[PDB]
Design an enzyme around this catalytic site. Sequence first.
Site, short mmCIF file in Angstrom:
data_model
loop_
_atom_site.label_atom_id
_atom_site.label_comp_id
_atom_site.label_asym_id
_atom_site.label_seq_id
_atom_site.Cartn_x
_atom_site.Cartn_y
_atom_site.Cartn_z
N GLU A 1 106.81 5.89 89.82
CA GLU A 1 108.27 4.65 90.09
C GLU A 1 106.63 3.78 90.93
O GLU A 1 105.75 4.17 90.89
CB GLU A 1 108.54 4.18 91.19
CG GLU A 1 109.73 2.98 91.87
CD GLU A 1 110.62 3.11 93.12
OE1 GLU A 1 110.68 1.86 93.80
OE2 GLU A 1 110.44 4.14 92.89
N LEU A 2 106.22 2.35 90.01
CA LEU A 2 105.69 1.28 89.71
C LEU A 2 106.29 -0.04 91.10
O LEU A 2 106.77 -0.29 91.45
CB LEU A 2 105.15 0.75 89.23
CG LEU A 2 104.20 -0.84 89.20
CD1 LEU A 2 102.89 0.35 89.33
CD2 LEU A 2 103.89 -1.50 87.89
N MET A 3 104.57 0.22 91.76
CA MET A 3 105.40 -0.73 93.56
C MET A 3 104.60 -1.69 93.51
O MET A 3 103.11 -1.95 94.10
CB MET A 3 105.18 0.16 95.08
CG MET A 3 105.65 1.62 94.56
SD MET A 3 107.80 1.08 94.68
CE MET A 3 107.80 1.15 96.53
N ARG B 1 98.12 4.42 104.87
CA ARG B 1 98.05 4.40 103.42
C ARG B 1 98.61 5.52 102.08
O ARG B 1 98.37 4.95 101.11
CB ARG B 1 96.21 5.12 103.25
CG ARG B 1 96.26 6.96 103.54
CD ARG B 1 95.09 8.06 104.21
NE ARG B 1 95.69 9.01 104.29
CZ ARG B 1 95.34 9.14 106.35
NH1 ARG B 1 95.70 8.29 106.56
NH2 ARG B 1 95.98 10.82 106.68
N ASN B 2 99.76 6.26 102.86
CA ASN B 2 100.58 6.68 102.01
C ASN B 2 101.89 6.55 101.58
O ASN B 2 103.15 6.86 101.14
CB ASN B 2 100.58 8.62 102.02
CG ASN B 2 99.83 8.81 101.97
OD1 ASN B 2 98.24 9.01 101.45
ND2 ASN B 2 99.17 10.34 103.96
N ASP C 1 101.42 14.33 106.29
CA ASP C 1 100.53 13.20 105.91
C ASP C 1 101.20 12.12 106.21
O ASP C 1 100.72 10.71 105.58
CB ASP C 1 99.88 13.66 104.68
CG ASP C 1 98.42 12.73 105.21
OD1 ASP C 1 98.12 12.48 106.20
OD2 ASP C 1 97.33 12.79 103.83
N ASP D 1 103.10 9.12 98.75
CA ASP D 1 101.79 10.45 97.90
C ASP D 1 102.38 12.03 98.59
O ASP D 1 103.05 11.33 100.19
CB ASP D 1 100.82 9.64 98.13
CG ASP D 1 99.87 11.06 98.26
OD1 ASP D 1 99.10 11.38 97.24
OD2 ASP D 1 99.65 12.02 99.56
C1 LIG Z 1 102.66 5.74 92.80
C2 LIG Z 1 102.32 4.14 92.80
C3 LIG Z 1 101.58 3.77 93.57
C4 LIG Z 1 101.69 2.08 92.99
C5 LIG Z 1 100.81 1.11 93.26
C6 LIG Z 1 100.98 -0.09 92.74
C7 LIG Z 1 100.35 -0.94 93.43
C8 LIG Z 1 100.46 -2.44 92.38
N1 LIG Z 1 100.92 -3.64 92.51
C9 LIG Z 1 98.98 -1.14 93.66
C10 LIG Z 1 98.83 0.54 94.48
C11 LIG Z 1 99.37 1.03 93.81
O1 LIG Z 1 99.01 2.73 94.35
C12 LIG Z 1 97.65 3.03 94.30
C13 LIG Z 1 96.80 3.77 94.50
C14 LIG Z 1 97.60 3.60 96.09
C15 LIG Z 1 98.67 4.34 96.07
C16 LIG Z 1 98.76 4.04 97.60
C17 LIG Z 1 99.72 5.06 98.96
C18 LIG Z 1 100.17 5.98 97.32
F1 LIG Z 1 101.46 6.29 98.69
C19 LIG Z 1 100.30 6.27 96.70
C20 LIG Z 1 99.17 5.73 95.83
F2 LIG Z 1 98.39 5.97 94.22
N2 LIG Z 1 102.61 1.82 92.16
N3 LIG Z 1 103.62 3.25 91.96
#
Ligand SMILES: Cc1cc(-c2cc(C#N)ccc2O[C@@H]2C[C@@H]2c2ccc(F)cc2F)n[nH]1
Length: 287
Positions: free
Chosen positions: A96-98, A148-149, A144, A165
């Site tokens: 999923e894209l966040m 950051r996660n 964890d 994460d």
């Molecule tokens: C799985 C996923 C990542 C993201 C995602 C989207 C955007 C946008 N715009 C920018 C950064 C993203 O992640 C970046 C790597 C850092 C991260 C942080 C916490 C985490 F828990 C996991 C991660 F990968 N969308 N979905």
Amino acid sequence: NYCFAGKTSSISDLKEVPRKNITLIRGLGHGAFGEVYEGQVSPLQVAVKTLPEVCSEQDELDFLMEALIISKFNHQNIVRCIGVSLQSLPRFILLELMAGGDLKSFLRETRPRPSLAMLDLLHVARDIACGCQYLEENHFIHRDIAARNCLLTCPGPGRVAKIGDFGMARDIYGGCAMLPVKWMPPEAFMEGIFTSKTDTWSFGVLLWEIFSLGYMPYPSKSNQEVLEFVTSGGRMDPPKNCPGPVYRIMTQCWQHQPEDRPNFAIILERIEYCTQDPDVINTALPI
Ligand SMILES: Cc1cc(-c2cc(C#N)ccc2O[C@@H]2C[C@@H]2c2ccc(F)cc2F)n[nH]1
């Protein structure tokens, strides 16, 4: 194999996406050592976690296990797994894209300046508490919990925070200087004991991260200094302007004995009570 919620599963159950259907659009950030990209699947918008081809065999299985773990969660506050592309190299996990990015950066980038309100912070806290409750209810220990996660669907109003994460839980299913000592309770970094009450302690630290607006916990202390500080009974002070009811949740999470800490159903209950107090949600954030 991997097991969760009474069911055991294997690679076969993951949905393999033909590599030809996957297109990379952007680099989005790094990790421990892997990369994440923005991606398309024919058109669906996804995040693509990549396994470096320059990797060992333990890494291989590490990467596979993460896919199995995330695939068996079904909760709105845990990022969805869309599939995998493991039969081609480099191996992909589709997620999923966040669009809001990670929570730590969002908090720092959004620190009010010459926008956010207390209620927005509580909803992020409630969101993550909801996912943690789903994990505890299913006997999954994240290990964890930290800003950051966590990820956000969008930066603007109506954002939803989700646990994004699971590398730590996969590693136990690298060293002392790599342990998240500042998020761990005494029995964890002293005895290596981990339970749902370990995640409870970590959530309290996450809660401090949220209401400090992205500060590093125990700001001026090192890992060892925190270890001696915490084992001796020391605890962080409230974040600047933090309402008492919110700080009082952190302190309950940081009880020295795990069985004096609340479970995540009670933490939710208390977070919701905080969203119901005008004196709380009308508190101004510092600039
Ligand atoms: C799985 C996923 C990542 C993201 C995602 C989207 C955007 C946008 N715009 C920018 C950064 C993203 O992640 C970046 C790597 C850092 C991260 C942080 C916490 C985490 F828990 C996991 C991660 F990968 N969308 N979905």
